[PDB]
Design a protein around this ligand. Structure first.
Ligand SMILES: [Mn+2]
Ligand SMILES: [Mn+2]
Ligand SMILES: [Mn+2]
Ligand SMILES: [Mn+2]
Ligand SMILES: [Mn+2]
Ligand SMILES: [Mn+2]
Lengths: 201, 201, 201, 201, 201, 201
């Protein structure tokens, strides 16, 4: 997990030419002000008119620099009816979330030694879920109304590996012949999938 | 921070005679079912008719055994108008929270090397805050309506050190002469304070 | 990363009814013998006549109990010509490997904040590679001969999330409608993919 | 706990304009000399003519830069007869100490899940005590002579949250109305307490 | 470093048939009493009439079970005039110590990338030293009186690798031919050294 | 163990005047190229015509900067017939290795609480071994042909404490009188040993 802090506060210095280190260098405390432990970036709903039908409003250290060194971060996800936060993975953290409105099918997948078990449940307002570090998971809006959830992570920068986008639209894309052997389908099927993720989202 | 997990899942075995270890032993996976990564315990508001005027609904590993080994936990706090979650400390975690309804004055205090600075702000619906590991902090409902927040921690068992209750109503209470030297007031003042925390809450 | 050790040795007790904890309980030192720090399980090549065209011979704590608490483990992967270790993820570790024979295209994919960059190179005998914790990666045999590599991990139980098998053949499988929204293709395409992973491998 | 070291030595560069990071940047090894692993700052007794009747001589990374990255630090506390190291907390470390001279009442308080138990004992020359990470604790000189102890921590910068001073004399002070609700006493009592900690110590 | 604690207290259960885990299982809190955070085992001087001319009084988790899970431990070392705590290593911790009486030559050795530098200084009453995790170090009494020091570690079980005893008197001893190649001397010299450590101390 | 990473990649900036921190600062991602996760430095055998009769080809972060922050590193050791990697220690990591060719006697020594037990075995092609963090260990070529092994570590910079060289040829050397008390032999024997390690290797 993220390294523990070695002082009370260390607000991230995000200017482009700052020296680079594991995580982020910090602003001098003299330049921090009173406001760094607070944020209002998750107050409004994100735009759900996207191919996935969901919008992620991030609140990691790049968006909330006061989280630097503190080992935590959050995000908000809004969903149009039938929208999905597609099968994805956080490489460096466990996720713990709460559904605020609507009805979401939440699915968590065990690794190979857990027999690739799929745990899935319809989670409603006020109900919570937990996603173990590095496991594949997804959310699907099964209600007729817009849904939204707010989650927390045990990292300032959990990272996100979107499975569909990484598999078919990385930069540059995984060679077709690699994907035909791995997916056990012909090249035409692989190219059809790639054509849907050519936009970069 | 909490030790990282060494397998996908390890639901806590909470029976009274289970062997004791750092954290908790786990139920055999065969006895876990499909439901351990989910909870509905924070769906309803807690009873705010208490001396503090707030109610904490806990969702640590004792209440949500599926969090065992995953490094995270949550809780919900409800506040009557003018109620407080009094100055307190979490010995083993950073807290990250969101106000869901109402208006809360949230205050975070730096340690001695930070000049004991008090950072405080009125946090409203959808706005977030972060409390660094082990620092004193509090919340006070400044609105005319009931307020509530949901927070996450970077520990399965953050712990809570309530300052007023620990100082004046521990078991057994800190001797009066220790408290008169520390608080710089006469014994009568110390005894008055102790009389308010004799109930254990 | 894995918790550090609190003593010299703690060989894993793998009997089925042993108490369950994070990681594994250990055999009494009196029952360990001289041989637990050694293994010969990776001496021979695995059977590459599988759908993927590769075979993984594991040497994690379940196969090498002397690794318990030491924070490390290994495995060997053998590849038939044109075979692949398909796009996969290790949820709890970084991997560091060496190609022993043959020619392998090794690809590592960055997360979303790294623009989903694909780093790929043909790695030959004696050459090494490193896969950051939790990122998607794969290997493909581009030579005309059988290839093999031996890798190490910074966990006693890294875990493996096989992307194709988890996406299309979990237990039970991810609903088709979830996968059609996520993959942006019709149900018939999703069902074709599922039919290839119905065997459990 | 503090991050582990990634090299033998990394003496802290404490100049005011050094770049800021978690912990401290280090002096080039060429500028370190032979003396950084040693100190004589705890050889003499501190001045106990203070309001608390005790004096803390710190030996954290700010006073002993050679501790940077090594995960440890110390301090010495001297006590006039009847003096106290008041109820306080270390946010980022466990403390382990030894009484060198005199008789000290040492008290350690459990958190809420430990029923706020007060463990207290008179500790004399050569006797030791341990304070778990983040718990409230104090020391009181019950002998007729000056007493002193030397303690170690499992952090280069444990931090110190003095309860009385933080509660009544932070900068700026916690509002009176917050403190009257939390302490369950009238404003006049709160103002009396605040008047004793207006000096900043 | 040692895993962080997941609760306030977890006194080690040291009975011989207790289940074995990383570190130690804990006594039920009901069986702990008030005394586990304290010890008087380092109050008296150890017997320095040994081949090394020094005596180590240990206060690790085997001798102080209340340290279990807290990440710290101590020990006391007493030295006859001209006695030594021979070149040794702690595999799992940094050491931080204070000389209480006498004059001790304290030497710390850097690793190969630090050019195997020897840092050494005569440390007197009240003066401190720090030994980075896993580096070779020693102490030698250069005064005419008995000397003693008390040290702390950042582990409940640091471990001790005595160089001379391990090299020449392990169980069973390292073969002579291995040692003649490594030490670049004839077999007769190696056998002479082995004869001095045949007693097991 | 090494601090976990807080981003995907952080290639070490090894220029001499780069700011110094725990571990290494990183190159801007814009200056990294595609090649940092790969290396060919262990493809060839090292020169075994040395006093020890073995050659270590290092692949730590100084030689493979792409390992920075990832918690892993490797090395290759080649051995002439009868050559040794002498009794040594890695202060900051566990080692896990595989013999690639030849026959090596591999010995691992327990600490004092493990009764200084010597575990030793002849390890051949494809067979593996594990060395717990900070314990003394060695390898000796018992075959008639050149032998070689490739090992991995759970640190980007494990460090190496060569016992013979550190004991008798540090800079500057440990005083003779310290070594005569510790080794229990006369000064002439100590000086003979020192004369063999005066070259610095
Ligand atoms: Mn997620
Ligand atoms: Mn709180
Ligand atoms: Mn892999
Ligand atoms: Mn203290
Ligand atoms: Mn020592
Ligand atoms: Mn080695």
């Amino acid at each position: 997990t993220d390294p523990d802090p070695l002082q009370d506060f260390c607000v991230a210095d995000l200017d482009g030419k700052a020296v680079s280190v594991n995580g982020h260098t910090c602003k001098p405390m003299s330049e921090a002000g009173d406001d760094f432990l607070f944020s209002s970036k998750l107050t409004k709903a994100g735009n759900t008119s996207t191919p996935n039908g969901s919008a992620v409003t991030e609140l990691d250290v790049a968006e909330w620099p006061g989280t630097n060194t503190l080992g935590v971060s959050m995000n908000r996800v809004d969903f149009a009816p039938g929208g999905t936060n597609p099968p994805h993975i956080h490489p460096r953290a466990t996720e713990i979330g709460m559904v605020m409105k609507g009805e979401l099918l939440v699915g968590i997948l065990g690794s190979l030694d857990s027999g690739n078990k799929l745990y899935s449940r319809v989670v409603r307002a006020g109900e919570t879920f937990v996603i173990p570090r590095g496991l594949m998971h997804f959310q699907f809006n099964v209600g007729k109304t817009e849904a939204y959830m707010v989650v927390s992570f045990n990292s300032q920068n959990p990272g996100i590996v979107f499975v569909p986008l990484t598999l078919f639209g990385s930069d540059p894309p995984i060679p077709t012949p690699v994907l035909t052997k791995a997916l056990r389908v012909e090249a035409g099927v692989v190219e059809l999938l790639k054509s849907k993720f050519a936009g970069g989202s």
